[PDB]
Amino acid sequence: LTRFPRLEFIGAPTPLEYLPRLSDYLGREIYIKRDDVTPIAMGGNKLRKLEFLVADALREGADTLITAGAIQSNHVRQTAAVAAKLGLHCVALLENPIGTTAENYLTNGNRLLLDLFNTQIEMCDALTDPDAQLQTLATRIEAQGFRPYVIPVGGSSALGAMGYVESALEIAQQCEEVVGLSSVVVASGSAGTHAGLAVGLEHLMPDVELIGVTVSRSVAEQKPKVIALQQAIAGQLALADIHLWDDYFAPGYGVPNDAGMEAVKLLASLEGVLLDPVYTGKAMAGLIDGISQKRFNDDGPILFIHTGGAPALFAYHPHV
Amino acid sequence: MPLHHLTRFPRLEFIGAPTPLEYLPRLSDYLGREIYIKRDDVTPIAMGGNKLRKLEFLVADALREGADTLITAGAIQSNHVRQTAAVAAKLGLHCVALLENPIGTTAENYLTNGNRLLLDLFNTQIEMCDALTDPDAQLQTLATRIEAQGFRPYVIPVGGSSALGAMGYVESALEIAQQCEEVVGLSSVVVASGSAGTHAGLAVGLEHLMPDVELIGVTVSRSVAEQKPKVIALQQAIAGQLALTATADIHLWDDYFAPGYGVPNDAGMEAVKLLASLEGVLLDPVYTGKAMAGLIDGISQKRFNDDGPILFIHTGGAPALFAYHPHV
Numbered sequence: 001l002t003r004f005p006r007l008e009f010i011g012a013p014t015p016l017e018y019l020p021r022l023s024d025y026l027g028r029e030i031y032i033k034r035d036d037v038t039p040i041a042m043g044g045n046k047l048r049k050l051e052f053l054v055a056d057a058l059r060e061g062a063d064t065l066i067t068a069g070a071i072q073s074n075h076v077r078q079t080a081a082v083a084a085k086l087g088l089h090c091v092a093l094l095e096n097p098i099g100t101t102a103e104n105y106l107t108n109g110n111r112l113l114l115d116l117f118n119t120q121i122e123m124c125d126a127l128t129d130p131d132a133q134l135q136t137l138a139t140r141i142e143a144q145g146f147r148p149y150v151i152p153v154g155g156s157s158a159l160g161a162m163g164y165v166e167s168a169l170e171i172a173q174q175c176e177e178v179v180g181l182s183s184v185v186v187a188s189g190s191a192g193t194h195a196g197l198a199v200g201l202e203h204l205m206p207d208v209e210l211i212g213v214t215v216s217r218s219v220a221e222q223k224p225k226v227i228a229l230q231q232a233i234a235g236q237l238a239l240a241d242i243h244l245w246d247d248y249f250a251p252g253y254g255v256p257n258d259a260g261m262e263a264v265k266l267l268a269s270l271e272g273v274l275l276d277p278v279y280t281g282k283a284m285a286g287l288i289d290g291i292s293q294k295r296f297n298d299d300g301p302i303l304f305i306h307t308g309g310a311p312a313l314f315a316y317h318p319h320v
Numbered sequence: 321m322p323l324h325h326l327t328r329f330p331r332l333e334f335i336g337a338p339t340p341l342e343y344l345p346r347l348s349d350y351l352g353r354e355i356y357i358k359r360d361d362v363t364p365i366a367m368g369g370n371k372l373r374k375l376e377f378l379v380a381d382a383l384r385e386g387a388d389t390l391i392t393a394g395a396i397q398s399n400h401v402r403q404t405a406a407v408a409a410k411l412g413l414h415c416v417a418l419l420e421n422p423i424g425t426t427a428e429n430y431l432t433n434g435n436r437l438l439l440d441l442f443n444t445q446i447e448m449c450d451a452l453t454d455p456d457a458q459l460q461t462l463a464t465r466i467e468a469q470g471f472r473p474y475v476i477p478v479g480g481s482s483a484l485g486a487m488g489y490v491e492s493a494l495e496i497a498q499q500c501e502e503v504v505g506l507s508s509v510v511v512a513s514g515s516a517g518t519h520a521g522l523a524v525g526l527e528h529l530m531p532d533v534e535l536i537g538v539t540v541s542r543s544v545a546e547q548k549p550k551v552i553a554l555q556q557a558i559a560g561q562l563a564l565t566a567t568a569d570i571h572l573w574d575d576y577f578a579p580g581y582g583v584p585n586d587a588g589m590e591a592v593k594l595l596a597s598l599e600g601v602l603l604d605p606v607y608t609g610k611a612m613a614g615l616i617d618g619i620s621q622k623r624f625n626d627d628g629p630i631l632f633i634h635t636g637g638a639p640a641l642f643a644y645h646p647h648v
């Protein structure tokens with residue numbers, strides 16, 4: 001996986017913990033990969049990607065990082081934190097994907113942390129073409145005398161996803177001589193984590209089924225994205241079918257549903273673990289329903305990749 | 321190893337590996353002095369904090385008594401209560417919380433968001449009192465009413481700051497000393513000093529492991545005269561429980577909790593802003609922000625014993641930011 005430059009944002013491998021009380025209530029061995037407890041600013045999955053993204057930015061001698069997402073994007077917040085830490089400027093192109101006017105979505109949560117990180121906020125109506133909108137802003141910013149480095153939506157490029165290809169080795173090492181996995185459940189947004197884990201776990205764990213619970217798209221729209229990135233990563237590294245469930249995001253991206261919210265309550269009351277309304281909560285709702293519908297190929301132990309997002313809870317409260 | 325009597329106390333592993341001890345290059349560059357950070361805010365259970373270390377001993381004690389209910393008290397946006405209720409949830413124990421509004425605010429986000437929001441998620445029974453005048457007697461009164469229902473309650477004092485709870489920061493001191501060994505010659509340590517458990521735990525530990533290192537407690541609720549004896553009583557109790565003598569003088573600065581506990585000040589907010597924008601580290605309005613403001617002004621006024629490296633203990637508190645936004 002090396003030969004690609006990488007910074008040290010995590011260092012120690014993130015915890016893999018048994019969930020006894022959730023396993024109790026579900027009657028099935030459930031494990032959790034705690035990528036939410038990464039050391040930088042309340043954590044998240046994007047640290048793994050930014051280790052490669054910002055390492056590439058320093059090689060190209062950038063002084064400014066530019067990315068995009070929702071107002072309450074964890075990715076934007078993690079990007080801003082890393083930038084501040086390294087002395088790099090940060091420009092954010094943000095949108096309101098749900099059209100709310102609630103003070104806490106507009107000003108609290110991840111968006112509040114952006115003000116603290118001194119992030120140059122740029123508002124747009126819709127991210128209809130993010131790659132081309134970032135490119136525009138990057139020209140404007142470099143015209144102002146800066147050296148910008150564009151980071152894609154969720155940092156979900158072939159290089160970005162290398163963080164989660166590497167992440168598979170951690171899982172393989174932590175599970176070995178302790179637990180024999182059967183299934184792995186992960187949230188599938190911009191496909192960065194899901195494609196990354198697909199390539200890695202194909203080689204490092206043969207008899208495991210990777211399930212991608214979508215948060216924004218249907219199977220028809222998500223399949224082409226996860227396949228393409230998988231074949232980009234495999235080609236980049238000189239090296240299996242994609243499995244997706246799309247029932248567990250109700251009205252769309254960035255809107256809470258009853259199943260996802262109750263999943264949040266479940267893992268907080270039983271395990272003291274904090275999920276989020278947008279990603280992990282919905283991803284967990286699929287996991288619970290997967291056992292319920294016996295949608296997994298067998299009744300063996302399941303691993304949930306906690307990708308973070310907990311700071312969103314403070315923005316979505318009380319409602320949106 | 322003069323701290324070997326620490327083995328006598330039963331302990332539940334909540335942290336695992338030692339928390340990061342990181343150098344802060346940009347802040348060091350700004351302040352003109354080598355600054356290090358002990359990251360106890362990155363403990364794995366429910367957004368972290370200093371109280372997790374203390375709960376490791378207190379909850380282990382609770383289980384040995386066969387208790388099924390943790391009862392504790394604090395502010396509505398207390399970090400201790402939140403961490404307590406998170407541990408209680410993880411171990412299948414009921415949690416009863418006695419909460420006060422300590423600043424008389426009516427802001428929605430202070431009353432319902434932040435730490436208070438997480439309390440609901442952990443299924444915490446909430447008891448609202450008007451003022452925490454006598455927290456020990458109020459917690460006792462509540463315990464009787466809770467056990468009359470049939471619960472087997474274990475009372476945890478404010479901030480978990482008994483001699484037993486404070487053992488988690490004699491533990492921390494040992495981590496610090498090991499991590500600094502032949503890597504950094506420490507001169508000073510800055511920590512927030514609230515209910516005194518962290519400060520006193522660090523006081524006892526550091527006196528025996530890093531005797532030449534100066535320890536500074538930046539008060540967040542009280543003056544030197546009022547805070548001094550609280551830290552000392554714990555200091556001496558902790559030492560006695562570990563078969564040790566503690567002769568070190570406690571040091572405190574009270575110039576940085578502006579109008580009172582839980583009320584943000586200008587120097588605090590700038591300390592929060594400074595570390596966020598320079599290091600991507602998130603402080604809080606109530607504790608670490610004011611403790612950092614004391615470190616900065618301590619450097620500014622030449623208040624430390626010398627010019628050497630300063631370790632800042634990041635005790636956590638960050639979830640309060642969302643509660644204290646936009647104002648109180």
Ligand SMILES: Cc1ncc(COP(=O)(O)O)c(CN[C@@H]2CONC2=O)c1O
Pocket residue numbers: 044045069073074075153154155156187188189190191192193194276279280307308309310
């Ligand atoms: C907590 C959390 N979980 C899951 C995801 C989804 O993972 P991938 O992006 O790797 O698929 C994201 C970010 N992703 C969102 C989805 O859209 N844009 C983003 O930044 C996230 O912040």
Ligand SMILES: Cc1ncc(COP(=O)(O)O)c(CN[C@@H]2CONC2=O)c1O
Pocket residue numbers: 369370394395398399400478479481512513514515516517518519607608635636637
């Ligand atoms: C982040 C943080 N720092 C410091 C403290 C105070 O440290 P000691 O209590 O160990 O001195 C607390 C909680 N303590 C407050 C202080 O009073 N009541 C409480 O619950 C806290 O949450």
